[PDB]
Design a protein around this ligand. Sequence first.
Ligand code: SF4
Lengths: 48, 82, 512, 189, 158
Amino acid sequence: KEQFRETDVAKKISHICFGMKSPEEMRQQAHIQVVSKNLYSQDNQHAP
Amino acid sequence: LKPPPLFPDTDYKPVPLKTGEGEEYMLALKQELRETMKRMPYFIETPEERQDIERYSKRYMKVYKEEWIPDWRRLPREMMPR
Amino acid sequence: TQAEIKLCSLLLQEHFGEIVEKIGVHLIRTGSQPLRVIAHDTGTSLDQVKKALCVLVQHNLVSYQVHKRGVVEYEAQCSRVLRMLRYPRYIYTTKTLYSDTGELIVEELLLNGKLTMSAVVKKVADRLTETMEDGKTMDYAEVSNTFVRLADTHFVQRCPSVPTTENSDPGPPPPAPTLVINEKDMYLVPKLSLIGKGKRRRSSPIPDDGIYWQANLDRFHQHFRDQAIVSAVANRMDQTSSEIVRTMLRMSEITTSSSAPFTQPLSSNEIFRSLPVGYNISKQVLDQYLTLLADDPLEFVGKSGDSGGGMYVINLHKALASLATATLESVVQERFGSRCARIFRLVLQKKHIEQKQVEDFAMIPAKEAKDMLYKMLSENFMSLQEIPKTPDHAPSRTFYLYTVNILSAARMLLHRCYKSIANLIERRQFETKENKRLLEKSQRVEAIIASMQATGAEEAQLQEIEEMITAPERQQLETLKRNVNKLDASEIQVDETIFLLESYIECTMKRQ
Amino acid sequence: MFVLVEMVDTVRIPPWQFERKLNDSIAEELNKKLANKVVYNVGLCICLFDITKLEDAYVFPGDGASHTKVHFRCVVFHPFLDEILIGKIKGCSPEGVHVSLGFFDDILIPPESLQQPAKFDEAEQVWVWEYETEEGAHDLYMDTGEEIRFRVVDESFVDTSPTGPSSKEAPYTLVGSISEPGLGLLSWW
Amino acid sequence: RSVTGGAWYSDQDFESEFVEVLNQQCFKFLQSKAETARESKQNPMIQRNSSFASSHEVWKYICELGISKVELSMEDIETILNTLIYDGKVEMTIIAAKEGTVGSVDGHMKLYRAVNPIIPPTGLVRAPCGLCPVFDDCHEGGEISPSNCIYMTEWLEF
Ligand code: SF4
């Protein structure tokens, strides 16, 4: 016996609200901070 | 590669606080003040709500107080609490 | 003004509660508007909005104005919400100037917001009953004496009053009563003779009807400004000189306006006769002190005439410019070292300069100044002006002449302090809410221990209650308490700064 | 302990159902969907009580089924505090005795609720009792026993919703009390 | 401005340690003389006159104790004294070169004699937030959320 949860979340779009992103939110959305200029690892594996 | 830790170290540090009997009294007065804001009508809390059942105890522990009214000649005749 | 709005929200939460915070923040966010749209926007019962507005106008937080088409508009001033932070300072200086009775008078007045003389003296007497015991009593006579003395000395100022109904606009009343303020009776206390001995909590019609009062915030701001000036003078030369300047401020205050750059004329003859008899000083000694004070190169005070032999006028605008400049030096010095303040001040006094001159004239090694100027420039404490070599203003064709804009500088510190107090308040609330579980666990057992103590119950509870886990957590509760105390001390000191920063941005502006 | 709560929902009736009268199909579907599960604010659902009102049965484009919105009432297990209850034991523990109502089992009697004289057992998990003059510290509570009388004193919802990107305790717990006379095993009184 | 750099440029550094210690020495000595003036409170006119620490006499005090064996005469001393006159160690009391010993040489008494810090420190500096290098960022709910400002955490600890 477990907490009931609704199964169907289906919905429909009603509006598009355009707008802007400020620095705080722009960081908040992102996962990581790109800090290195390079593309691939030095070794022959060429891993990013 | 590794970005700096979220707290880079700073050489300078905040200067030591000033203390004294007057300052202690300011601190205590500020505390006492905070306490006063919780014991008069102007401290508008949400009106009590959502009783569970007709508990017999309701007769005795009910909070009783007079209805707060400001003197009405200083305000618009539009917002009577009744 | 977003940090400021955060302060408004915080202090509304702490003073009044959620719904009051919500209404106040929305109103200070949207401007003067009629009630119905506020109720719509908030979506709560109009009863709540109504009650909150009544409470707010009672404390003079919000103000209502009759408007075209017969609607009533409700408005708030952001400055007014930035004052309860100063109430401790108000009470301290009033206790310094008046006995505890004046302190209680002022406390009651600010806590209530508006009150009449009879009820305030009665409530002060009642709340004082627990400050003396063993049969001691008091009458309203002494409280009235203190109140009239306070009102005479302008700390107490009368609230507005309604126009007379039978005199003006007879018939149905307008939407709002449109109160009016009268200036001649601002310090005119009404009369009473009632006296009553306060009840010592044994648990066993108005002559001054309608004459409300409220503390004079401007007098307190002026008084604080005076104390700051005296403190500057005392440190500048000497205690004797500050006692002298405290004199010229005294006869200045009773007749000077708070806004003018210069005080009313004063003479050394009236300074001397006003000079305390407890100081062994002669008229010639005073005359010498005044002449050498006027000769001070910081131009703290100027001559401006010769009436009465000694004639001198303190320069308010210039001093506050000096007051503010110094604190700008202060923030730079600690956060960036003496050498950095060495350069910053250099750039201030040299209105236009370049780096090589700075290194030459600031004894700074190469590769140590350059980076530091860049840091000040990055932080915007330093503003680059950049005259060109050619009309294209190309960087290869310009000179990097530095410039200071003190008024802009102050503004960002205000912003800093606003965020600073905000973050302290939050941290204290964060600490309070996380420890609330242990606080209430302690408070209930403290109440249990304090209960039934006078009933004569057995003593076999002091140790038995203490056996629980709270005891080896009391030192953590003490750690909590000192952290709160220590945060609060930090808040307190920050307000003392705010007063000077605000004092300048006010004085530097003309508000035309 | 039982309480009656009003609800609303949208029900999809798959098209091979259309023969049977609608009301029956919605009732069955709601019982299917909600029965024997617990809501985060009203406790454990038993079954629907009745259907009050029904809207129109639309057909959305791209699908054969008919969607209807329903107002219905459902009886829910939601005991309030200080209710007197009778229930079989289901297991002893150092932190208290577990009790069962048959259909529900998350009731704990903590030792603070137990009578003062008995505090622990002879290292055997079967909880013992003690009393002053008679009952010389030899009575003990069988893990099933009879339906002991007890009174609820605490309750809580604990959330179990998923956390983080995707790819065992019940969300409801009660606390009972046994201290007062006349409670516990009927043989005592 | 090469090898010359002002003769203090020895070691090709402006001899930073020596220039700073020399400035500290001048400062402390002229404090001592202005302190004789202040201790005496000589008939204030003469109190401030004695607080005019004569910088030709400072120049003669700095040739000795082995300090300014390097180029000293007016120019180089006067300019290092001037390096000290570009901050709040000083304030205008030169009265041109004619009043005083060549204007007490660039006014090397000016207000070194005192100009006591107009005001004390500032609450802002005596608080973490204001000192925080990383400002902005710290947003209600975020990485540097003010609910962890280690600067505070530390300022809290101390
Ligand atoms: S990071 Fe913390 S200490 Fe620094 S400015 Fe932001 S809130 Fe203040």
